[PDB]
Amino acid sequence: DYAKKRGWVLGPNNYYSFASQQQKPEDTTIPSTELAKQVIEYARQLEMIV
Amino acid sequence: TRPANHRQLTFEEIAKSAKITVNEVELLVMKALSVGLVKGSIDEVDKRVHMTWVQPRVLDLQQIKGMKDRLEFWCTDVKSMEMLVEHQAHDILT
Amino acid sequence: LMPYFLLTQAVRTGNLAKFNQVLDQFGEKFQADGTYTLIIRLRHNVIKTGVRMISLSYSRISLADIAQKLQLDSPEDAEFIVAKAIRDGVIEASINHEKGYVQSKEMIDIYSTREPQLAFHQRISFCLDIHNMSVKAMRFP
Amino acid sequence: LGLPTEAYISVEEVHDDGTPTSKTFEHVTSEIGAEEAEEVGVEHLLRDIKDTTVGTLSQRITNQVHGLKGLNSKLLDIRSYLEKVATGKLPINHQIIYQLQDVFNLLPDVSLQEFVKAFYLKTNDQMVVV
């Protein structure tokens, strides 16, 4: 029953199936589109008060 | 041939393609560097050559049609950024 | 001091009998305060603190040892309780389900990659908000 | 987009491995100058319309936009040549152009896990600003 949907093998003693390993994959160095937003916003509230 | 991302050549591919024994590949590469055809640098202990380059080669019309699209992406990208900044900050720059 | 100090003192130590003694003594006061959750859960969640201490000190330990360190008398239920603790998020360790091996997470990677500036953004929001609030309500007449 | 003037000088060339030598121009870099008692008249004429000498985020920010305009202009102008040569409307200037545009596509950079470790500079700007 578990074998039909869950991973591993049904009593094998050497389970083979899909893995539940998780990797962050945060290599990307480009939050540039939003971080630029933030900076422009700071410039926005340094001005427009008169 | 290789797509810039993988510009590191293992010794074994060189030896296989030039039909020479492994112990000699170093000297081959060194000769090239000294004449000035290519200008990478080598690490013998991982046994990889890391190549950056300066020499062009002759190119036919099919490659030209090809690289036109690679160039074409760049202009859409630039225009997207200038539009983002104009909209986000017309308040200040006016 | 009279009830709560005797409690936390019993809790850090492993004396269950003294815990029962204090409970018997001051249950009336505890119910009078309307905070009688302690017997409900505190009595049966003591082992969490022991697991936390183990997390803070050691970094690679054989689970066959925690049993003698936390008087569980068996390794398997120790595996169960540690697994439950990690799922609950009290500790982020990992287990080698092969040879009684419990290992801590990776070392703290670095304290200056994208986690810092996330805080300075909040502090700017605060500071600029305060300055605007201050300047607005100045000199009504 | 930019400057009003161009300057050119005439020189012959080796031209190739072997095709006839000829005479054509080459570009030389150009700049606009000033001198005492010519700038004073200019500054007087331009008094009505003026801009901030340095600017405080109202002049630096505009500059970046202007720069992006210019860059995109050049990149679009490359098409009008390279596309029509791909149509075969005009002959290939194999000798020069393609070698330079191989160099170009070689020279960009990449975000390669080592460069992003120079993340540790953004945060040190912020803990002096914010």
Swiss-Prot record, chain A:
Function field: Component of the 26S proteasome, a multiprotein complex involved in the ATP-dependent degradation of ubiquitinated proteins. This complex plays a key role in the maintenance of protein homeostasis by removing misfolded or damaged proteins, which could impair cellular functions, and by removing proteins whose functions are no longer required. Therefore, the proteasome participates in numerous cellular processes, including cell cycle progression, apoptosis, or DNA damage repair.
Highest taxon of the lineage: Eukaryota
Quaternary structure (record): Component of the 19S proteasome regulatory particle complex. The 26S proteasome consists of a 20S core particle (CP) and two 19S regulatory subunits (RP). The regulatory particle is made of a lid composed of 9 subunits including PSMD8, a base containing 6 ATPases and few additional components. Interacts with DDI2. Interacts with TASOR.
Name of the protein in question: 26S proteasome non-ATPase regulatory subunit 8
Protein's organism: Homo sapiens (Human)
Similarity comment: family membership: Belongs to the proteasome subunit S14 family.
Curated annotation (Swiss-Prot), chain B:
This protein's record includes keyword Iron-sulfur: no
Residues modified to N6-acetyllysine: K16
GO molecular function, one term: structural molecule activity
GO cellular component: cytosol; extracellular region; ficolin-1-rich granule lumen; membrane; nucleoplasm; nucleus; proteasome accessory complex; proteasome complex
Tree of life domain: Eukaryota
Gene Ontology biological process terms from the UniProt entry: meiosis I; proteasome-mediated ubiquitin-dependent protein catabolic process; ubiquitin-dependent protein catabolic process
Keywords: Acetylation, Proteasome
Protein task: Component of the 26S proteasome, a multiprotein complex involved in the ATP-dependent degradation of ubiquitinated proteins. This complex plays a key role in the maintenance of protein homeostasis by removing misfolded or damaged proteins, which could impair cellular functions, and by removing proteins whose functions are no longer required. Therefore, the proteasome participates in numerous cellular processes, including cell cycle progression, apoptosis, or DNA damage repair.
Protein family according to the UniProt entry: Belongs to the proteasome subunit S11 family.
Quaternary assembly: Component of the 19S proteasome regulatory particle complex. The 26S proteasome consists of a 20S core particle (CP) and two 19S regulatory subunits (RP). The regulatory particle is made of a lid composed of 9 subunits including PSMD13, a base containing 6 ATPases and few additional components.
Name this polypeptide is given: 26S proteasome non-ATPase regulatory subunit 13
From-to range in the entire protein, with total length: 283 to 376 of 376
From Swiss-Prot, chain C:
Domain PCI: 1-109
Name of protein: 26S proteasome non-ATPase regulatory subunit 3
Role noted for this protein: Component of the 26S proteasome, a multiprotein complex involved in the ATP-dependent degradation of ubiquitinated proteins. This complex plays a key role in the maintenance of protein homeostasis by removing misfolded or damaged proteins, which could impair cellular functions, and by removing proteins whose functions are no longer required. Therefore, the proteasome participates in numerous cellular processes, including cell cycle progression, apoptosis, or DNA damage repair.
Top-level taxon of the source organism: Eukaryota
Subunit: Component of the 19S proteasome regulatory particle complex. The 26S proteasome consists of a 20S core particle (CP) and two 19S regulatory subunits (RP). The regulatory particle is made of a lid composed of 9 subunits including PSMD3, a base containing 6 ATPases and few additional components. Interacts with UBQLN1 (via ubiquitin-like domain). Interacts with ERCC6.
Residues with the Phosphoserine modification: S62, S74
Family: Belongs to the proteasome subunit S3 family.
Gene (name only): PSMD3
Curated annotation (Swiss-Prot), chain D:
Role played: Component of the 26S proteasome, a multiprotein complex involved in the ATP-dependent degradation of ubiquitinated proteins. This complex plays a key role in the maintenance of protein homeostasis by removing misfolded or damaged proteins, which could impair cellular functions, and by removing proteins whose functions are no longer required. Therefore, the proteasome participates in numerous cellular processes, including cell cycle progression, apoptosis, or DNA damage repair.
Sequence position, cross-link Glycyl lysine isopeptide (Lys-Gly) (interchain with G-Cter in ubiquitin): K50
Name recorded for this polypeptide: 26S proteasome non-ATPase regulatory subunit 7
Sequence similarity: Belongs to the peptidase M67A family.
Additional facts recorded: Does not bind a metal ion.
Stretch of the intact protein here: 131 to 260 of 324
Residues that bear N6-acetyllysine: K74, K84
Complexes and interactors: Component of the 19S proteasome regulatory particle complex. The 26S proteasome consists of a 20S core particle (CP) and two 19S regulatory subunits (RP). The regulatory particle is made of a lid composed of 9 subunits including PSMD7, a base containing 6 ATPases and few additional components. Within the complex, PSMD7 interacts with subunit PSMD4 through their respective MPN domain. Interacts with TRIM5.
